[PDB]
Amino acid sequence: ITGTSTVGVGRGVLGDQKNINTTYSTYYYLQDNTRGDGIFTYDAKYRTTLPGSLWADADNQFFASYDAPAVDAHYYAGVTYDYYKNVHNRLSYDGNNAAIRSSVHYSQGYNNAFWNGSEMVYGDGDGQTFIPLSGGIDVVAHELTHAVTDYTAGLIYQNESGAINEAISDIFGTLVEFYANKNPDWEIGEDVYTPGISGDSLRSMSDPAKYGDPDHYSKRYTGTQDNGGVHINSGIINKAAYLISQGGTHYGVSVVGIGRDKLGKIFYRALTQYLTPTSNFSQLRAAAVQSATDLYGSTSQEVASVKQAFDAVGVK
Ligand SMILES: N[C@@H](CCCC[NH3+])C(=O)O
Ligand SMILES: [Ca+2]
Numbered sequence: 001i002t003g004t005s006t007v008g009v010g011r012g013v014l015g016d017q018k019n020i021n022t023t024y025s026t027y028y029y030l031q032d033n034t035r036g037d038g039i040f041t042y043d044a045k046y047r048t049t050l051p052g053s054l055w056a057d058a059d060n061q062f063f064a065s066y067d068a069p070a071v072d073a074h075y076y077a078g079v080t081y082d083y084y085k086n087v088h089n090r091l092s093y094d095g096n097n098a099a100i101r102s103s104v105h106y107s108q109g110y111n112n113a114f115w116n117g118s119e120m121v122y123g124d125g126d127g128q129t130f131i132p133l134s135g136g137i138d139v140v141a142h143e144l145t146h147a148v149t150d151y152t153a154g155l156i157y158q159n160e161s162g163a164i165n166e167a168i169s170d171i172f173g174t175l176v177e178f179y180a181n182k183n184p185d186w187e188i189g190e191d192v193y194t195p196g197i198s199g200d201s202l203r204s205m206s207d208p209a210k211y212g213d214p215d216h217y218s219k220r221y222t223g224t225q226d227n228g229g230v231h232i233n234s235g236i237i238n239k240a241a242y243l244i245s246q247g248g249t250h251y252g253v254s255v256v257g258i259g260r261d262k263l264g265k266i267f268y269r270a271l272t273q274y275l276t277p278t279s280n281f282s283q284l285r286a287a288a289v290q291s292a293t294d295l296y297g298s299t300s301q302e303v304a305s306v307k308q309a310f311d312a313v314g315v316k
């Protein structure tokens with residue numbers, strides 16, 4: 001809509017208050033004009049037709065329980081846009097400041113969230129396995145990163161390229177979580193998963209095997225479920241990235257950590273310059289090494305760490 005930019009206040013899924021950017025025109029809408037061509041959040045009203053209605057609110061105050069997921073989807077998309085812009089100099093997912101849209105209250109008891117090729121979609125969860133998915137900043141950034149990949153490497157969603165695509169989304173959702181300093185960790189979805197159980201998460205980058213995902217190439221899944229194990233085999237790549245960043249000894253191989261910032265720089269460069277739709281793990285290793293070489297020099301420690309980390313997960 002056309003209107004006046006303003007700021008409203010509300011409460012997120014976890015109960016935390018935050019300010020959000022709104023647009024006033026008779027109603028207050030969840031439309032943030034401060035970022036690129038705008039961030040817009042929609043109400044899918046428990047249906048599966050998309051996008052639903054642009055979020056309209058009467059008073060610029062979003063404290064109703066039905067508002068919670070919209071507030072977080074709206075806010076976390078802003079943060080993620082900021083991360084890309086500030087950190088990598090990239091304007092929105094297309095690099096051209098494309099509007100960012102998300103719908104919430106998608107379907108009923110839907111335990112998932114996704115990027116559908118045009119926008120983001122978030123379920124409310126069933127209240128047992130998950131609470132509304134947009135309450136996790138790593139979830140929001142994982143989804144938005146899928147847009148980034150679509151517009152850049154374009155990794156197809158199956159087999160190795162598909163696992164790389166998902167790992168990429170976990171790496172970057174985690175770097176975003178550290179960026180916002182929102183109780184950061186190397187776990188995925190900890191904040192919205194199994195409200196009943198503390199301590200767990202959906203996936204672990206630090207120890208994928210903790211939840212039964214592979215942490216070495218020799219353990220890859222080779223069947224057909226999950227599109228050829230996109231969400232399973234991403235653990236091998238997640239582990240590698242954790243090592244590059246944090247360092248460690250894995251399967252006897254020692255890796256000196258080079259930190260998060262360099263991890264992001266390296267991976268972002270690989271994604272945007274070297275990866276292709278059909279790249280496999282071995283190709284990702286080459287890309288990562290080339291990126292680091294570019295950035296830091298072939299005899300750099302950085303290059304060394306990237307090599308070690310892949311060797312440690314068995315990726316040649
Ligand atoms: N995003 C993942 C994890 C969600 C867990 C199942 N709802 C998937 O599509 O498998
Ligand atoms: Ca966290």
Ligand SMILES: [Ca+2]
Pocket residue numbers: 138174177184185186187188189190
């Ligand atoms: Ca996390």
Ligand SMILES: [Ca+2]
Pocket residue numbers: 190193194195196197198199200201
């Ligand atoms: Ca839990």
Ligand SMILES: [Co+2]
Pocket residue numbers: 057058059060061062063
């Ligand atoms: Co209100």
Ligand SMILES: [Co+2]
Pocket residue numbers: 142146166169
């Ligand atoms: Co994903």
